[model samples]
Structures are given as C-alpha cells and as structure tokens.
Target: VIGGKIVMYAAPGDNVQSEIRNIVRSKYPNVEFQVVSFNNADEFKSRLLTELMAGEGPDVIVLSPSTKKGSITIETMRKLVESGVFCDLEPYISKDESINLSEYNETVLNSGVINGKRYFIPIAYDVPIFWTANSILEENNIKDEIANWTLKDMADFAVQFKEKNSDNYLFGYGDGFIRNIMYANWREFVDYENKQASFDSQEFVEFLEAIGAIEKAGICDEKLIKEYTGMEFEALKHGKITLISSTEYPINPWELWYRNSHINYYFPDSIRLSKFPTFGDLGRIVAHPTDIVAINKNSKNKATAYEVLKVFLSKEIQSSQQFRDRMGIPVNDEAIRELIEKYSGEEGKTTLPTMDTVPLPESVVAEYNSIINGVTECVLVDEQIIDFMIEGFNEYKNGKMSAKDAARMVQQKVNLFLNE
Candidate 1:
C-alpha cells in the first residue's frame, strides 16, 4: 500500500470537495489524502502547471474538462496522458469485479474515455430541472403539481400566474434561458464529429419565439431576473418568483430546509424531470458528471492509488450518512439504490427519477456557457431575439450562410471545442 500522502487540487468552497474529503478520510483512515483548494479555475490551472513545470505536481486532481473558465482543454488532457502524467485506468477497471461498469449511465462513462481508454473516474451526476416556489404557486391558485408540466403547460401557467399574482412573476429569465431555448429547439450547440456550430435551426427560431412570447407576456420581469442574478436562493425563499431550473441533488436539501422552516419551497406533486419540450421531435434532457477523479501517472504508488480508488468506490463509503444529498447521488447503481431505500423521505424519493435523465455530450456543454451569455445579452439587454440570433448565425457562417449553415456552424464549433 502507498504510505505517502496523495495531493489533490480542488475547487475552493465547493461542497463536493468537502464531501469527497470526508468520504476519503472515513474510508481510508490509514492513507493520507491532502487537498489543496483554489478559488478559481485560473488559480487551479496555474498552480497545477507551475507544479508540473517544477516537477512537483499533485498526485491526483479533480476538474471538469468542460469548465467555462480556467479550463484545461481535452487536448491538454490527452497530452498529459501521453506524457506519462496520468495513469491508464483500463486494466484496473477491467479487473475490478466489485465495480460494475454497466452500472454507470453509458454517456457519462464514455465521457471519460479517450481513443478507447478510460482516464477519469466520474463521481457524481448532475441535471437541470424545474424548481418552483411553493408560496407563489399557492398564491396564484395553481396546483402544487407543476414538476410534470410540459413547456406549453408551463407557459400557460406562467401567463395565469402573472395575471393572478401581481406581487410576483411566474418565471425568471437569465443566461440559463439559453439552455432552455436550445433544449426546447432540440438543437445542440456543438457537433463533435462534424466540428461545426449546430444551433441555428428553424426549431431554434421557434424556441426563441416561445421565449419571446413569455417575455412579451410579462410572465418574467427584469426585477425578478436581477434578483436571481444577485441572490437566487434568497429570492426563492422569499417567494418573489417561482419555477426555475436547478440541479437535482442540491434541490432536495434546499427544498427540505424551505419546507421545515415553512419558508415556502415546493416541488411539483407530480414532477417529471424529462427532456425539454421540442418544436416537433422529442427533446432530450442534458445530464452529466459534475465531478470526476483521476490519478497521476507519475505517482510512485500506483497500487495505493488503485486501492484508494477502490475504497472511494466502496459501498460502505458511498452509503455513509454524511454523503446523502451532498456530493450528489452515488455513481454506483447499487449504492444509489441503497441510498434511496435508506433515506426513503419525500426528498430522497425525488432524486431517483433524476438518475434516468440523459447526459449531454461534452461538446454540447462547451458551447452552453457562451451561448447562454450571448443569448442573455440579447434577450435582457438588447431585447432583439430575432436580430441577435440572425447576427449570431451570420457571424458563425462567415457572412454567406443560410439558416442551416448558421446552425451547422454553431454545432461544429461546440463539437470541436468539446472534443478537443
């Protein structure tokens, strides 16, 4: 067994890092796991690069290849792997009988694979779903069962909620609206295989039209958007607005606190966290691994690293009380099942359906932040939905582009960056 400490670089103030540390300390009491946290991605990358250049980098690191800022590209990851800086996990994965590779959702598992080899171990899955303020729903005379509401249903409700409740709005729009629009259009920002933009489609325009209708209907106001930008959770607690997108795990704890405090948080009685509605075809929900662990190839203790990995993946560690609703649902299926059974509360049960959601391709995620940012600027600031989209398409297609050309360009760019 490796006796020396393994250093890990993680995001600062991230609850996931704290959860991981707790799990590791509890599972491997004998092993020394030292984590060095950074406030931002730039700091993490700079520190990592400095250490690597000095030949004194950490033995393991936690990062997302699709990060918006201070992110290392996929090409950089591949280079690290080739330079003997990252361990090849195929052998360990193949031999680990206790770990069922099939237990993991296929898309998430494939995300860590490069040219047919697994290089990263995913720890948690995250998906975006609708979250509503219980008080707002009640005040508007709407049923508490909105989680299963379709896009059109939600729109209709938003209109009604606005007319009924003068003090609050039905939904808040922001950068996240871009994601909702793209999902509704059934268009991805990137196409890895084709290496071009892909979001400028007829469906995308239709989706924008729907969003415009919501904006025009006054269902969402600038004040609500500003409040969400500044203090989202607080706004939800005070019930200024309702129905927003949230990650699956954190929602439970957040809602539980809201309910226990009688602070007015409520999930739809019949919530259906499915794919975003499509213009014509059925849209697919986007989900992905929010955290992953990878071992350094240059580590002196490969066996110990493997042992630590196994321990982290152990059933006992996964099911510990400290972890529920924290680091997200367990990556291991059996452990997840046990968690659901043991917790058995209303919140615990809600997390089960979330596991079935589909994960978006990494390429698709690369363009999300940028797309959202641009769209937010257009919708909130410019208020020129059609103009901004058209401009985005023209810029993407080098001036001479059809509607399809613009969409293809977005798809290609997203795929290229994600796959890089």
Candidate 2:
C-alpha cells in the first residue's frame, strides 16, 4: 500500500472526481485517495502553484490539458519533466504486451507521448459533434429531412429559414460554431509538417465567407452571437439556437435535461467522425481525449504508485458496472470489449463512437485550438473584418513574429500556447 495519499484535481461538476474516488476505494480499500475540486482554471493553477512553491504537492495529480486555461505552459511541463516531477510511462507501457495498444486511436495515444516516452494515460475522450434542436427543426418542417443534408445544405437551409421565419434566425452564426464547422468541413488552419500557416487557403476562405454570408443573410444576428459566446448550453436550453458543436459530455447533460423536450439530435449524417476535412478533399470528424493520468516522478513511492495506476488500468476496475459508462470509454481493450458486450445495442451504440473514431493528433490539437480561438475572438469581440481576421491569423502563424508575440497581440492568449 502507498501509505500516503494521492491527490487529484478535477474540474467542478464533471462528476468524474467522485466516480474515480469510488472506483479506487472500492478496489483498493486501504489506499488513501483524496480529491480536491477546482472551480475553474484560475483556481486550479493558483492552488497548484502554491503547492509547488511550498514544496508540498500532491503525490499524483490529474491535470486537464493546458489548452483549457493557458495555465500549464510548455515551459512548466518541460520544467516538471526535467525536475523529475513527472514519471515516464514508456517502460511500463512497453512491458505490457497484453495491453493491446493498437486498439487505441493512434492520434489520442500519440498525444500522450513526447520524445518517444509516454507521460500520461488518457481515460476519457471528447469530440465536437452537431447538436440540433428537435422542436425547432420539426416546427420548420425540416426535422424529417435533415439526415440527407450536407453541411452546406444545412447552411442553405439556415438562409432559407431566416428568410421565411420573420422573427427568428435559423441558426446562430458565432465564431465557435464557425470554427467547429471549419474543422468538421476538414479545413486546415496550419500545416505543421510544411512549417507554414495557411488559414487563407481558398477552401478556408470560402468557409469564412460562407459563415459571413450566413450572418449577412440575416440567418443570425449580433445578439445571437453574443449569447453563444462561451454559453453554448444556455443557448441550447432556450432554443435560441438551432445548432452548435460541442464535445460529447456537454451533449450528455443537455440531452438528459431536454430528453422529453422534443429535441431530436444525432450525429451529422454527411460527416462521419474521423479526420478533419482536407482543403479540397472531403472532411472527416475527429474526437479528442480529455483526461489523462500521469504519475509524478517526485513521488516518494514510485513502485506503489505504479501499482495503483495498474489497478486503475485493470479490466476488472474499468469494466465494473459502476465505471462502465461513468468514466466515458475505457482505454483498455479488454475493458472496452466488456463494455461493448454489455452495452452495445441500438441506443448504446451511440455512446461508443468517441472511442471508435480517430483521435485528433496532439500537434493538430495544439495548432487548431490556437487558430480557432484567435479567429473566434476576432470575429466575436474585436469586430474585425473577416478578411482582415484571416490575414492576421495567417501572418501570426507563419512566424511573421514568434508565437509569444503573436499571442500577445491577439486578444485571447490561450490559443498561442496551443500553437507553441
């Protein structure tokens, strides 16, 4: 037994903290596990920093991606790695031949690795998917026919709906939705391999113009844009918006809340969850992992901690009834097979797509998060002309200035970190 304690920091209301604690306690019984909840990213960073300064941090920390708050800088990660504060899991992962690493989406698994060594293990994944309002679609007489429409077709419908429905807009044309649509449509924001930023490609420019056209055509207004800014669920609840893109977890809560509210939402018919759309090529949907468990190298009991982690990774724990769907999808192949056997059917099938779909590469995650955030802020807050916004992003990403400089100039700085 690791006689001490393992402290975890999880996002508030995520429901994952309690679930994890329960799983650990039920299995280990003697091991001490403590969870500290953080209301937001600021609090999480502040607490962590304070702990680090005092030289008394948790034995094991559960960290969200730095993309969330720009708090976990690359510098910080490097420092942690260099100081031997984060354990390298390569040895363990390599030793376990039965782990069936192939079952994992390559992009997701690769994201957890750096310099050929894995530092983190993911537990749950989140992917952006389309969520539509059933009542609104039905009232507009489009509910029965939405499955056949492409994204462009949806935009066309929005335009038509706006023209026909005098008082209300057909969709909310916000930067978030626009960025997601761009990704869903498979437009690249930056070409990392080629070492160039090209958001202004004809295809991306067309995407921006299409969104602009939707806005100009009166499909959505400034107020709708304002309402959707960081308030997706609120907008969806009020039926003020017809469609938006969000990760699977967010959709779960909304669906549960409105299950009886006449909302008929499902995956986009034309867009299968896979890779993002290429410039001229067709688009593919992408799912990204959200949580990963990394051991702290500074821990006093490395072997015991590894044991604890092994237990956490075991099929018995992962496939338990309480954890089956509670933790999203299991990363372990045996556990996944168990989940599929127990849950796979008509309705249960939908919940497992994020597991089955391709994971977004870490590099892609970093690049796209930055680019999309910059574009969103410019479009929503700066009120910059869409053309100018496109140019600014292209210049910034092309190393016209360093990532730091570009980020400073950009109103939102979090995206810059992702780019780095």
Candidate 3:
C-alpha cells in the first residue's frame, strides 16, 4: 500500500474536507489527506500561486472558473498552466486502467487542457437554460421547437410577438438583459489566449444594434422581474413576461422541473426548457465547470494525490447522491444516469401542492441528455469585461453613441484590462 498524506486546498466556507475525508477513509484507509481552506477564490488562487512558486503548498488544488464575485479567471489558470505548476493529468489518465475518458462528458472532461496537457479536471458543471411558458407558445402559435432557436431567430420572434401582444415580451430586458446576452456571447468577441478584443467587428456591432432594437420592441424591463416570491412567475402568468432565464443544477432533474412548475401556479407545465440563445447554430448549451481539481507538480506526494483525485472521479463516490446535492451534476456518467434513474419513476408522476405536476416529458429528458453530450463551450465570463461591455452598450442604447463607436470604446477598455 502506498500509504502517504497529501495537502488539498478547498474554498473558504466550503465543507469539502469532511465529505472528501469520509470518501478517502473508506476507499484508501492507508492514505492521509489534509484539506486547507481559503476564505474566497481570490484568496485561494493568490495564496496557492504564492505558495506554489515558493515550492510549498497543498498537493491537490480545487478551483472555480472566473464568473461571480471576483473568482479566479481562466486567463490566470492559463498562465499557471503555461508555467507548468500543475501536473499534466493526460499522461496519468492514459496510464490509469480504471479511468475511462469516454464515460465522462467529453467536452467538460477535456475543458482544462492547454496546448496539449490536461492541467485541471472538472468534477461538476452547470448548464444554462432559457425557460418559457407553454401558454406563451400555444397562444402565440410558437412551437416548443423554438428551443432550437439562435439569437437571431429569437429576435425575429420577439419582434413579431411584440406586434401582437404589445405589452408582454419573451425575455427580461434592460441593462441586465443586455448584459446577460453579452455574457452568453462573450467568447465570440474576445481571444483569451492572444489577449485581444474583437468588439470593433461588424458582428459585435450588429449584436449591440440587435439588443438596442429589442429594447425598442417593447420587452419587459428587468425592474419588473422579481425574486424569491414568484414575482417573475406572476409576470409569466399574466402574460407580462413569457420567458425567464435560469441555470440548471442537473444533479436532480425532477427537482429542477418541480421548482419551475411551482414558480408559476397557473400554468403548472409552464416551464419549457431551451438552451441559452447563441450567435451560431442553436443547441450549444454553455456550462460552467465547478469544483475543478488539479495536482501540484512540485508535490512530494504526487502519486497519492492523484489517487485521491481518481477517487473523486470514481463511480462509487460519484454515485453518492447526498454528497453532491450542491455540487451541480457529477462528472461521472454513471453518477448522472443513476440520479436520472432515481427520479425516472417520477418522470411522469412528480407533483407539488396547488400545482398540477406531471412527469418531465420523455422528449425533454432526451433533449437534455443530447444537450449535455453536445456541450462544447465552458463559459468562463470575465466579469470586468462584461461590466465594460455593459457601459458601452448603455451609451449606444441611450443614442449618445453609435453602435460602431460604442463597440470600439469597449474594445479599448477590454484591451486595457487584458494587458493589465
């Protein structure tokens, strides 16, 4: 037995140590694992880099992507990868017999690779969905097939829908909506590797113009979309709003369906799921990787650290449903299927109080399964870039600047940030 201990880093306020400890104890009792927790992603990333460069730090590291609240950015991760601070996991995976690369989501499994080496392994992920009411679809003669629509298609439909309904719209509009669209589409305009901005392109200019056009088309303002009290649901019910945006934590699919149903009391089957609209062909669902794990290249206990890493990806622990209630969908294919099976019986019978609950349609399940497999882009939003883009859009939408000029201004601002 390779009896050894490895230091692991975890996010501050995270209770991962206890859960991971239990798994490691049962699976490899001979191994000792210590988890060092940091107060936030910023602190975790900064301190981890400092310690790593100094040749002292945890052997195993967990990190989240750049998104909210100043989390670690992918650009930072790329720099670390280039410096070769973390072990190249591809060789390790190739040597390990128990690990099957095909069993995990192919796109997500390989999301952390830079140049040619795998530096980070994603343990969980979230999928974004565009939720719309069935009533809106039926009343407007819009089919459930709009789930396949791209941004342009949705915009065209929004214009027509506005012509008829005058008061209601498909999405929450305003700076938030404009910002959300930009967030979803940011990857297209920015080259993270070259640290370049493409906001001055015709495509980006058109994107800005499209959003401004939507604002003029009479979409509901973000101010009207409420929270925690089903306020957005009231808008959906009264036809004040038709579409609501939300991200899916697919560990429990039934739970997702149930929450969507309960949100709108009138149209219990209100939530028709769609992928986040894309600039290109639709059906591209963006996922954000979470609980990302990597091993330190300088660690003395690299072998044992990888052993613990494999266990985290192992089917036994991956199948432990309760352990992953908040961890998004497990990376293990079997774990995902197991959860789906557990809720399979409720597929047609799931219900809630004061709401008509029916099973998630077989079609919906099949669609989601396909979408999960098809996910290729892992969206790591640079919040600063999004903020800059929003500021530029506000100038354009206020008619104070042309779309072209606004995009160029955003380009300059982002270039400054990237160079910094």
Top candidate (lDDT) = 3
**Relative to the true structure, how large is the alpha-carbon lDDT of every model?**
0.48, 0.45, 0.68
Question: Between which residue pairs do clashes occur in model 2?
Answer: 85-297, 186-277, 274-285, 275-284, 277-283
TM-score of candidate 3 against the unseen true structure: 0.81
Task: Indicate the residue-level lDDT of 27 in model 1.
Answer: 60
A best-first ranking of the candidates according to their TM-score comes to 3, 1, 2
Clashes of 2: 5
lDDT of 1 by residue, 1-420 (tens): 445687777654444455555656666677677877688756877777666645667776565442222223232443454345566788877776766777654554555665456777766544444444444456556543553455566566656656766676545545444444442332233333343444655665444445444543343443554555334545655565565653323322233333322221232222222233334443445444445567777777665677666554556655655444345435565665554443334443332212321122232223232222122100001112223444444453344654455555555554444455
In the range 1-420, model 2's lDDT, one tens digit per residue, is: 444567666654444446556655676676677767777756776776567445656666655432221223222443343344567887866766655566554454555665456766665444444545445556668665654455556557767867775665445544444434433432244332333344434544455445544544443443554555434434545655565443223222212223212222332111111122223443334443444566766677564455456555566655565443344445555655544443223333343222332222233233333322222100001112222344444444454754334323432322332244
Predicted candidate 1, C-alpha RMSD:
10.0
Model 3: lDDT to the true structure: 0.68
Error (Å) of candidate 1 at residue 361 is 34
Model 2 ranges with Cα > 4 A deviation: 1-5, 18-30, 34-41, 49-56, 66-85, 102-107, 133-154, 172-176, 182-187, 193-195, 215-241, 247-279, 310-420
lDDT for model 1 comes to 0.48
By summed lDDT, the worst window of 10 consecutive residues in model 1 runs over 374-383
Candidate closest to the true structure, highest TM-score:
3
